[PDB]
């Protein structure tokens with residue numbers, strides 16, 4: 617269990633960013649690691665087999681605004697990025713989840729197109745294949761996996777921001793709606809802790825949110841927990857050693873550098889570190905420290 621870092625890839629501040637930086641909760645340190653080959657905001661991160669993957673996003677720069685179909689793989693042992701097979705379609709404001717060593721890419725936008733499509737990557741074959749689409753088009757969608765089921769939470773369908781959520785059952789290649797959240801959320805941080813899916817922050821169409829709610833997959837209810845100290849949309853999120861970490865985002869005024877940590881036993885959030893610069897729209901995941 618020792619030696620794991622929280623990696624943050626990409627993001628946005630004035631333009632899309634190429635940063636890869638890693639935080640060590642055990643000593644408070646940050647490391648700046650190899651830049652992404654292509655800057656991207658609105659991407660997702662995940663880990664399979666000790667390797668960090670950056671999926672989708674958009675490169676917003678002074679010279680263009682290009683949605684990404686890319687999958688790139690970072691090896692901590694070499695501090696190098698390598699390209700992998702690209703997805704069927706560009707997906708900005710994507711969500712991803714991992715089931716049994718496979719990466720699921722969910723939703724996202726391509727220009728004015730709001731995807732319901734979903735595709736699955738096989739690392740051993742370096743291949744993507746489309747699976748059943750969601751029941752709803754969703755960009756800015758939060759995705760997480762619990763008990764080998766994939767959840768897609770909130771987002772924006774092209775007309776309305778959403779409180780709805782749905783679950784993918786892989787053995788039936790089928791999506792079904794679940795109970796909707798209490799709050800409309802696009803750009804929330806979504807993760808899994810114990811037997812619940814958490815949705816933290818986001819934008820409800822009017823304001824960035826500090827509220828946090830969790831879906832108990834047995835009882836099918838959403839319950840609010842303690843709110844974050846900061847309102848935040850387009851935040852990064854991960855779980856590490858039984859606590860939720862939220863990174864950056866936008867509070868309606870500032871691109872935040874603060875990182876907050878949720879302790880479920882006390883139902884409290886605390887500020888634990890600051891990123892090296894404020895940013896939103898990052899991808900976050902946990903893996904071993906680099907060489």
Ligand SMILES: COc1ccc(S(=O)(=O)N2CCc3ccc([C@@H](NC(=O)c4cccc5c4-c4ccccc4C5=O)C(=O)O)cc3C2)cc1
Nearest residue numbers: 627628657658676709756802803819824849850866896897
């Ligand atoms: C070209 O400029 C960019 C700026 C930031 C980014 S991003 O990577 O951070 N990101 C991608 C993922 C994602 C998902 C949901 C939302 C939700 N919006 C908001 O909270 C929102 C609403 C009103 C005004 C603003 C924002 C916002 C949010 C963040 C930064 C600045 C602002 C801002 O001023 C929503 O639309 O639901 C926003 C994003 C934004 C990308 C491009």
Ligand SMILES: [Cl-]
Nearest residue numbers: 715716718786
């Ligand atoms: Cl699978």
Ligand SMILES: [Cl-]
Nearest residue numbers: 716718736738
């Ligand atoms: Cl298979």
Ligand SMILES: [Cl-]
Nearest residue numbers: 738739740741
């Ligand atoms: Cl595989």
